[PDB]
Design a protein around this ligand. Structure first.
Ligand SMILES: N=C(N)NCCC[C@@H](NS(=O)(=O)Cc1ccccc1)C(=O)NCC(=O)NCc1ccc(C(=N)N)cc1
Ligand SMILES: [Ca+2]
Length: 223
């Protein structure tokens, strides 16, 4: 997260860190047994870390739980990031409390101008590299599709939406991949892709979760 602020320990209780020996992606806890992340975050040997603030220190509210199963979207296409969503089932149910809590799926898509919260342990520099140990947060509006249309040479599909700033300096970034964009108490986005980070007139692109609610519920129900 570039140009954000320190969230405060456990103020984002649905935020998870995916760990394969080190943090490599964010994700969102959607019930006591399942996490939603990005398809591009797919790897073998995922440990899900809940209740995290400082990812380098055991502070006492962490729960580490191995994934039993990962399910990349059936139609995920890595060269376009189309359908960039994956579900991860936990080997055991999380113990829910005030620091480890699920986030609701949306009932409808959110409208442009709505304020959302993006969070993660990703890069904090638009040029160069600094990875934070505590969770970072960024308040960011949904932009009109029209506002972001001309921002890339790469295809932008209807399974993607635009969130962030045209003025530059405020954005999600590498290492934020898979993490939440939450708007009015609903998981509307998944950190997916963008051209660099925090560049002028180059906002980020996020998996449009409101298109996936049927697939998510059905997949959870059958697994
Ligand atoms: N098919 C498409 N759309 N290709 C373009 C996206 C590739 C890549 N962008 S990039 O940051 O690595 C560097 C880049 C690549 C091509 C052109 C300009 C700049 C990228 O984002 N790859 C995945 C990735 O790195 N995701 C992490 C991430 C998280 C947040 C942002 C953000 N600025 N909101 C960017 C990347
Ligand atoms: Ca910790």
């Amino acid at each position: 997260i570039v140009g954000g602020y320190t969230c405060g320990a456990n103020t984002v209780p649905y935020q998870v860190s995916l760990n394969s020996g080190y943090h490599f992606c964010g994700g969102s806890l959607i019930n006591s047994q399942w996490v939603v992340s990005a398809a591009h975050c797919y790897k073998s040997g995922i440990q899900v870390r809940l209740g995290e603030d400082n990812i380098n220190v055991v502070e006492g509210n962490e729960q580490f739980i191995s994934a039993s199963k990962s399910i990349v979207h059936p139609s995920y296409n890595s060269e376009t990031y189309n359908n960039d969503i994956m579900l991860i089932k936990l080997k055991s149910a999380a113990s829910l409390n005030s620091r480890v809590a699920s986030i609701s799926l949306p009932t409808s898509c959110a409208s442009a101008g709505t304020q959302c919260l993006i969070s993660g342990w990703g890069n904090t520099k638009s040029s160069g590299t600094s990875y934070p140990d505590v969770l970072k947060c960024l308040k960011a509006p949904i932009l009109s599709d029209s506002s972001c249309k001309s921002a890339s040479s790469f295809i932008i599909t209807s399974n993607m939406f635009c969130v962030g700033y045209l003025e530059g300096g405020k954005d999600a970034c590498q290492g934020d991949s898979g993490g939440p964009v939450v708007c009015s108490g609903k998981l509307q986005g998944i950190v997916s892709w963008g051209e660099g980070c925090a560049q002028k007139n180059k906002p980020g692109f996020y998996t449009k979760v409101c298109n996936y609610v049927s697939w998510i519920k059905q997949t959870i129900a059958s697994n």
